[PDB]
Design a binder for this molecule. Structure first.
Ligand code: CLQ
Ligand code: CLQ
Ligand code: CLQ
Ligand code: CLQ
Lengths: 390, 390, 390, 390
């Protein structure tokens, strides 16, 4: 049992483990676009001879509060063979990639978790919240205050340029935003066409400042699933939902969105936009505590304050926050706040309140005023959204 | 079609309309406890002769941010006969009760809505959020950080005094908290016993600083439903959930809680606490804008600011917020913020952000800095919860 | 945390823990009949003051192969409070009752398990198999060979004497048979009547040599559930099933029976008797290995053989089996067969083959001929059935 | 309406009737491999001109107790047109094939039945039992006694040689085992690949002494279906199940196995391996009573005995069984045992006990000692399994 960077000769064994581990994984052609994002030395394999474990990271760009874009190591393609469970393979692979990621100078790593109980112990905290809304569009009426009482129905492949430009504006202005490389647009637009005994055709609704990609469900022919709605203005968001609610042959429109989606408030009956599912989205491991805390912007409303933050096995820092900026310097002064690394990841994009984590003892301080100040400072003006799964 | 305060001779016709309108309504004995809370002139009936419409309010005490307790008119028992729809009965009954409530000096009215599209147009905004969590307790393990790694299993009727004292502490410290009168404790403890072909027996878990009332579901014998968990400390909340997760004969524990319930963070897998349902809880109509805005406490973190707020048909006010206090005085100066009355009710307990309502055009300003300041100021340190339905 | 025999003052706390632990437990009146079977010193309670754990045994008579009746300690009413999990309460209660049971001279203990993963580690093996058959009686035709091509439809309470006499003959001739005391007949016949919003009335089919007790399902009005069919002859079994298949208003007849129920072979289509559920029934802990192995009869077909059997922490014995009898004497000679105590319980009534347990390594020998001889000898001529849950 | 051996010109009409009769039947390419197993004169067709009935047999090799391999006529492709029901076509086709099978010298015929009420009257008895186990693998823990606390994840098409060799060892040592010809391995490995809008890819787990072929369900993405597990040793069976329980992305693993599968005993909770389905597997018609009874081996444990067996319209025989061998000679001496031919088929591989068939009057004797001796003698040391459907 050795742990190495894979050679081109390892990739067939990796694709077998992938096919057997990931139901969404069609075959090698799938991985081609994503592999362009994996740097030299971005991958590890465990050999027993055959591949019994693998893991890699991709080079991503993640938007954080203050419209700051961080280089981000996106962990993916993580699998242990069913023959080799409880042998410490995941721990050994995560330790090696984290060493490489930290040495390469990434301030943060990120992943999407297949289960919620695995990645906490390696320092990852859930940092965005997926919120599925299902609208019974047969009853949906727009409120007198709703704007637009400008959208075209189009084939996605015919308007690639406009989708790319709208998404680029959205990903730079929204925390959780990720740069989407041309190879991932190629993939996305390939999935837009109908598959024999698979998905139905995707259509687009296109506004100058937003787009919605949607397709009728395979089996439930009265359900339209919105795969992605990117709106740069409130006017575009409202205009796009007026068009979706105009899908008169549908009973129901579902979307995976974020907890602060204003959709319900656009309707005379807010209860029509039902939360049908909630789950952790992006997970974040802070690799360098001071680089990460200094990089993000903070709420201007909270006045200047100083404290001492200890991350369990991640350092102790003098943290001063004022005028929307943090300074985070080494100290041996007594800790006023303590938390595990994963908790910091959960606070970092504003998706979870320090007060909530404190009430579960995840965050530890003896100062309730300091807790209120942390809550306010780490809050994000622009609500955190989830870009695309990787 | 006349609209009057009911005489004792009207109540049999009101109980018939009630039985036909409310599936939860067993008979006159139900209403007895609640009727002790209805003041003289708290009720209206429409006669065609028989009762075709009714509505009333109860005298309540509602906790708002800053631990301030407001006298509150609780609208309830609202029904129009199925013979008399689209005759303006609800509008006429709500106009009359609102006149009486305002003249009596109540700063706020509140209700629980049977549908989400009715009460907005009469000035009520959804002000609390019901959040059902279902835990698959067979997988639930507590996180190493969770406290208490002190609770007794008891019969509710044998510990009335301790439940009453715990709830009284909780309702004074939590926004959304409602005073519970002795007659409603009588009702609650009567519903605790098993019913022939109805609910199963309720049990209690009792801690010095919290209690949980729960009962196995009628038909799903592997589901325990927590009807009410009131915890005054984080230690009590955690200790009570350790005991609920100890119900080894159950697969699932469900509770109707609030969006900031720390339960998920107590577990090694946060995904185990699944959101299975979300809905508006308490609705709030601000009756007197200046009395209500001056009564509640505000976030100390936001520095002093002044603006001019117009409520559509509710006045225009110079609003100055600093040191956690508001002053709200008449002005004819130009409005910087405009919103309908219902929107103010939705902001008032901190359950909805001004920014979210602004993005749906419900709240209207041309100043993004003022929006951030309103969001921060109206936010509640202690998360808003829902007391009990009325 | 003390462990004691309960006084009459402990029983209210035991009934609270019972109500909270067992959904089938109506109240103290339930336990009255069963409590007549609990000997002095048959019960233990753990006090923290309130009852946080309890367990007891009843005096039973269990039929084993060879029509031999053993005094049997029936463990029941076992519960640990949800407040007191992972404190070793079950282990401490089982250790104390086992000490008392062994000292009192019981050769075997027995229980029905609420979960399949608990009792193995205390030496209990599953010893009978519950097998639910559902017949689509609309297609059921009897085979030309089936007997009876003599039964009365009766009210159970009017023929108590005849049911008692038939059951007494059946329980003495069938391994798994249990003596049913008059107080359990009182209970059974009380459950025969309809309950408001509960079970429907039970009817009986009565033959001189068998009876079937059945009732239409609460909600599925086309399903008849046979709660108990006791047939002393093949003619009675066939005659009773002809009558059940005559329930022309039903679609389906279900029964919880044993794997060798001949019902399917009575039909022209054996597939009509569908196995819809299977589960462990009675569990058996052999308390005294030599007393138990010498008491039961063995297959006459297998010729005399001798071996040395070791039970893990239960002794090593020279075991000689011939002419349907075993002699089982102390030895320090080398073990030819080894197994944990629970495995012996699983073999004891003939429900599980030594060969099957050997293939999972539960039973360990290096002699395949000895395995075939054990399989044959422990096999039961009369198939093992399950009497009634306790 | 004539009954003939088909010419090559009949096969298009046979493929039409096949397509209309068998949902599993894709087209002529399906039948190609199976047709290599049909001897000259192995097929009959009824013509009205078009094909309204067909039936054929394949040359098979079936393993019976004692590791004896019998030439076996496998009936298959049996269909009557929906236009021609109740015209005696099936009876006429079965009479003709049985004449040919008996004259060709086959001692037994076998089939898989589409319904359970058809083939009894033509002398076929159900001889193996299909037993579906579904494991909730999220709770599955191996017992301390389980072996292996050696398997590779592989693509089936890349290890054909090893699967062929393992299966050949398994089919010779297991009653119910069938020789699998190269053309059926070609078919099997063709079905291993994914189909557009059909089955997902199959994977293999490969041990030196066993293999498991499995694939994720089409629609239930948390269910893995084991299509075939062939283990020549207990160590291989346990090692393969450790790997299947390592499919961490699955909730449930299902397999169609046999009633004596030791899997449940490998787990700390035997109840986790739930029986979700049971059905007759292989059916057997004894064509030559003396050839069949003399060919199979018998239990060595039962001492020498002699009896006289009558098969209804199948002869009367002096049957002497001792030292694991039978001698079966013509007699006119009085019958001590009588049964229809189908009953003998059901006894022949040890899947059904003589005592069980006797209790339904299918087997008739006045000697209970003779019944015990038949039960013991016909029992199979190695439990009967089902090879592959034909
Ligand atoms: C956990 C399930 N998986 C892994 C295949 C899908 C995750 C989401 C999708 C868009 N990501 C992917 C889909 C397909 N191939 C890929 C190859 C690499 Cl290297 C990385 C990510 C990939
Ligand atoms: C909309 C459905 N309803 C009205 C009966 C139940 C609402 C919640 C319950 C606890 N409230 C009530 C239940 C029963 N009776 C009552 C009598 C009056 Cl005056 C007021 C409230 C009541
Ligand atoms: C595990 C679920 N339980 C325990 C109450 C029911 C088991 C089957 C039933 C017939 N047994 C019982 C039912 C009711 N009360 C009883 C009191 C005693 Cl001491 C013992 C057994 C009892
Ligand atoms: C009753 C349903 N059927 C008959 C097609 C499928 C039975 C099982 C499968 C593996 N057997 C078969 C599948 C496909 N074609 C075949 C052609 C012949 Cl001659 C015999 C058997 C065949």
């Amino acid at each position: 049992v050795t742990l190495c960077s894979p050679t081109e000769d390892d990739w067939p064994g990796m694709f077998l483990l992938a096919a057997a581990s990931f139901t969404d994984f069609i075959g090698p052609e799938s991985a081609t676009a994503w592999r362009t994002l994996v740097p030299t030395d971005g991958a590890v394999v465990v050999r027993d001879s055959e591949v019994v474990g693998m893991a890699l990271y991709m080079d991503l760009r993640l938007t954080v509060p203050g419209e700051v874009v961080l280089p981000t190591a996106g962990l993916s393609f993580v699998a242990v063979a069913p023959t080799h469970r409880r042998r410490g393979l995941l721990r050994a692979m995560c330790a090696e990639l984290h060493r490489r990621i930290a040495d390469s100078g990434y301030p943060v790593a990120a992943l999407h978790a297949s289960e919620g109980g695995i990645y906490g112990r390696f320092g990852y905290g859930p940092a965005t919240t997926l919120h599925e809304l299902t609208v019974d569009r047969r009853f949906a009426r727009f409120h007198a205050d709703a704007p637009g009482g400008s959208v075209r129905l189009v084939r996605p492949t015919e308007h690639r340029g406009e989708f790319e430009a709208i998404y680029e504006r959205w990903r730079q202005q929204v925390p959780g935003g990720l740069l989407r490389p041309q190879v991932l647009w190629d993939e996305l637009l390939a999935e837009a066409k109908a598959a024999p005994g698979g998905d139905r055709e995707s259509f687009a609704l296109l506004h100058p400042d937003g787009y919605a990609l949607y397709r009728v469900d395979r089996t439930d022919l009265k359900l339209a699933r919105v795969s992605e709605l990117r709106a740069v203005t409130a006017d575009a968001h409202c205009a796009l939902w007026r068009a979706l609610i105009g899908l008169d042959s549908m009973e129901r429109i579902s979307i995976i969105t974020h907890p602060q989606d204003p959709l319900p408030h656009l309707l005379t009956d807010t209860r029509l936009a039902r939360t049908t599912w909630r789950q952790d989205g992006l997970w974040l491991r802070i690799m360098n505590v001071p680089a990460a805390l200094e990089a993000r912007g903070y709420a201007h409303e909270v006045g200047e304050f100083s404290t001492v933050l200890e991350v369990s096995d991640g350092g102790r820092f003098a943290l001063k926050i004022g005028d929307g900026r943090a300074r985070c310097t080494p100290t041996d002064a007594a800790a006023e706040i303590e938390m595990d690394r994963d908790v910091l990841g959960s606070l970092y994009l504003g998706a979870h309140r320090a007060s909530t984590l404190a009430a579960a003892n995840r965050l530890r301080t003896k100062d309730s005023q300091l807790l209120r100040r942390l809550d306010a400072a780490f809050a994000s003006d622009v609500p955190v959204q989830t870009a695309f799964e990787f």
